[PDB]
Amino acid sequence: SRAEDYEVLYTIGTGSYGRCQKIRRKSDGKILVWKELDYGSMTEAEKQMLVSEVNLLRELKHPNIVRYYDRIIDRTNTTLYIVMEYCEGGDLASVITKGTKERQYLDEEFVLRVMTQLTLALKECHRRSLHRDLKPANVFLDGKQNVKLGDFGLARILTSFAKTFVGTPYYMSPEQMNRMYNEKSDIWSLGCLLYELCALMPPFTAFSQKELAGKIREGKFRRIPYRYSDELNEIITRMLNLKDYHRPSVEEILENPLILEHHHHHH
Ligand SMILES: Nc1ncnc2c1ncn2[C@@H]1O[C@H](COP(=O)(O)OP(=O)(O)O)[C@@H](O)[C@H]1O
Ligand SMILES: [Mg+2]
Structure with a gap:
């Protein structure tokens, strides 16, 4: 210290x-x-908030959380x-960019690792509930094929106008768009991330917020590339259901026959 x-x-x-x-x-x-x-x-009030938030950060100990x-x-x-x-493996946004530039789709096995390990990170977040952000730029890889959810950002819980404004909210669920706690909203965001890992683009694209919201509300998107199994497409598609109650729970995701021991962390 x-x-x-x-x-x-x-x-x-x-x-x-x-x-x-x-x-x-x-x-x-x-x-x-x-x-x-x-x-x-x-x-002083802002610094006090910072103290409480650092302490909450310290409480989250999980193999799939940074x-x-x-x-x-x-x-x-x-x-x-x-x-x-x-x-050492850096963030997933960089991984996606690399895939795009090198014109190479990511292995299904890699997507299954991310699905398994981030679902477990979310499970822990839900147990503790806590700001979390599932965008690719906030998901990290170590040197042993482990996937970790990154910190939300202390100051971010607290420039925040700049990117809350400029940025396009690609992963925002239909219900959060109507009104901002709902653990099924995290499942939608996970679906968006996994979809983007497969397609190298998010399921709903747009140049404006209005256009994006229109697409999100319609709930339609291209199938992920055919190199990916029908089983993987099925589960991602379920996560992108318009109804929160049709999306799989953390428990239901982890019960999927796709998910095996080797997709979990190994340190
Ligand atoms: N635990 C970490 N290990 C390795 N690289 C990281 C880690 N956390 C952030 N980075 C990288 O550091 C850079 C700055 O990111 P970060 O500090 O998270 O700020 P922001 O959330 O504002 O982007 C990014 O390139 C990011 O990928
Ligand atoms: Mg960050």
Whole structure:
């Protein structure tokens, strides 16, 4: 819990609220990341919210959720560093982009790993209920074929106008579009992600929000590519049902004959 306990190796990327940097823990040489948060402009009330939210982050321990390790205050630069597990495989948005550029669809086995492991991450989120975001850019891969749901973003729970505005809400469920808790809405979002992993495009595309909402409400989309099994297409399609009560529960997903031990985590 001191900055001097770690050495920054390099900046992985700049997020909406600060840099994510690869770091090395001096005690044992463990490779981790930290995320920078500038709290200099925050009120006491906002900082109190931040404290409560960091503590909730610390409570989520699951093989399929990016692990929280530490928090560091650099009072001199009013910077809070949140230390977390490093995921060497990077994010799924990059995986999708790679598939598109290299003109190569992803293995069904990979899609099954994501479905299995993210469903389990969601199961844990539901048990604890908690902001979560299933977009590909927030799902990560380690070096052992494990899939981890990334942190929501402390500042994000708290720039937030910029991308809440500009961005297109590809994964928003029909019911959340009418009015924002519903665990079946997470299943819809999972369906969108899995669909995009298969098709390399989301199930509903549009250039405007109005157009997108129209498509979402109609609930129609192309079949995922034919290289993917009818069984996989079936389950993704069920997750994209207009009726929340027709979408499979976490339990129903995991009972699917597609899902086997090897699709789960192995550390
Ligand atoms: N645990 C992690 N392991 C490896 N890379 C990460 C991790 N978390 C975020 N990244 C990467 O760091 C960069 C910044 O992302 P992030 O810090 O999550 O901010 P934002 O949510 O605003 O995009 C992105 O390239 C992202 O893929
Ligand atoms: Mg993030």
